[PDB]
Design a protein around this ligand. Structure first.
Ligand SMILES: CNC(=O)[C@H](CC(C)C)NP(=O)(O)CNC(=O)OCc1ccccc1
Ligand SMILES: [Ca+2]
Ligand SMILES: [Ca+2]
Ligand SMILES: [Ca+2]
Ligand SMILES: [Ca+2]
Ligand SMILES: [Zn+2]
Length: 316
């Protein structure tokens, strides 16, 4: 909407206070004009029609329990926008400052979040498996990264290309979490997953097997569930990414870590310059080796480490 840019204040899902960019025109709307062509957050009102209504508030204060998922969707979209712009010189998901839209309070007891081809969508969870999913910065960045992938490599959402698609979202979700620097880790969704159980998460990049996800190509799932295991086989690539950044010895193969910033540069270049809609794991290895070669040189430690990491997870 047309209005004047303002700054509201509220509390997120975990009870933390934060400032949010809003727009005033009769009401205060969750419309952040400070980033690209805007970040817009909508209320789906427990229904499934999208996007719903642009979030409107009478007083620019967002401290109601019902407000919390909107506060976090809006704020963490901003953080993710900043990450891509400041770190990768990418302006929004399309590279041309496309408006970023999110809807919260989607459906009832909805234990998931997704990119629907045009916008991000967040369930509130059922209070047992999840609390409102926008409370996780890694989750928000995971979802916006699906949009980045769709506008770039275009990895088809099934089988190996789909597992790469998933891993790319977990990787950048995690790198954004580190960028914001609040309780960062290599786990996925820990902030909003199972409020009754401490210390767990939906997936782990450092040890995917803790939740029965594969950490070696020999253990890949080849059935039909979950689009051919896109959220399962992502473990193989997530493990490789973790090893590239942090190092380690995995099934006897030692990897020299090169750090998160270089992981991010290598995988962003692979995603945007080399991967295609049908890339498989072997092709991702080649893309990452080439990307590291472009950035650091053929004889670099960085190139050697990428190779070590893919060797370690059994991808040739
Ligand atoms: C199991 N879910 C997840 O891993 C994450 C949420 C996680 C980070 C909390 N959500 P996601 O974005 O991977 C779920 N997406 C999904 O199932 O895609 C189906 C689809 C939905 C709409 C259009 C096309 C395809
Ligand atoms: Ca209010
Ligand atoms: Ca964390
Ligand atoms: Ca995390
Ligand atoms: Ca938990
Ligand atoms: Zn995903």
């Amino acid at each position: 909407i047309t209005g004047t840019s303002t700054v509201g204040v509220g509390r997120g899902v975990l009870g933390d206070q934060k400032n949010i960019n809003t727009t005033y025109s009769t009401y205060y709307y969750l419309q952040d004009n400070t980033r690209g062509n805007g970040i817009f957050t909508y209320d789906a009102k427990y229904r499934t029609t999208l996007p719903g209504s642009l979030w409107a508030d009478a007083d620019n204060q967002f401290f109601a329990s019902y407000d919390a998922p909107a506060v976090d969707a809006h704020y963490y979209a901003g953080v993710t926008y900043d990450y891509y712009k400041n770190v990768h010189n990418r302006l929004s998901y399309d590279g041309n400052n496309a408006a970023i839209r999110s809807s919260v309070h989607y459906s009832q007891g909805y234990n998931n979040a997704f990119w629907n081809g045009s916008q991000m969508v967040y369930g509130d969870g059922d209070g047992q498996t999840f609390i409102p999913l926008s409370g996780g910065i890694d989750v928000v960045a995971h979802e916006l990264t699906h949009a980045v992938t769709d506008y770039t490599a275009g990895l088809i959402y099934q089988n190996e290309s789909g597992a790469i698609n998933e891993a790319i979202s977990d990787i950048f979700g995690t790198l954004v979490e580190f960028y914001a620097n609040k309780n960062p880790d290599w786990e996925i969704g820990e902030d909003v997953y199972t409020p009754g159980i401490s210390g767990d998460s939906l997936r782990s990049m450092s040890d995917p097997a803790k939740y029965g996800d594969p950490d070696h190509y020999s253990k890949r799932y080849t059935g039909t569930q979950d689009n051919g295991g896109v959220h399962i086989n992502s473990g193989i690539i997530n493990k490789a990414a973790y090893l590239i950044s942090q190092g380690g010895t995995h099934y006897g193969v030692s990897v020299v870590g090169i750090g998160r910033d270089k992981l991010g540069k290598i995988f962003y270049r692979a995603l945007t310059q080399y991967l295609t809609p049908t890339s498989n794991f072997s092709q991702l290895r080649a893309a990452a080796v080439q990307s590291a070669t472009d950035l650091y040189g053929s004889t670099s430690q960085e190139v050697a480490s990428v190779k070590q990491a893919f060797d370690a997870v059994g991808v040739k």
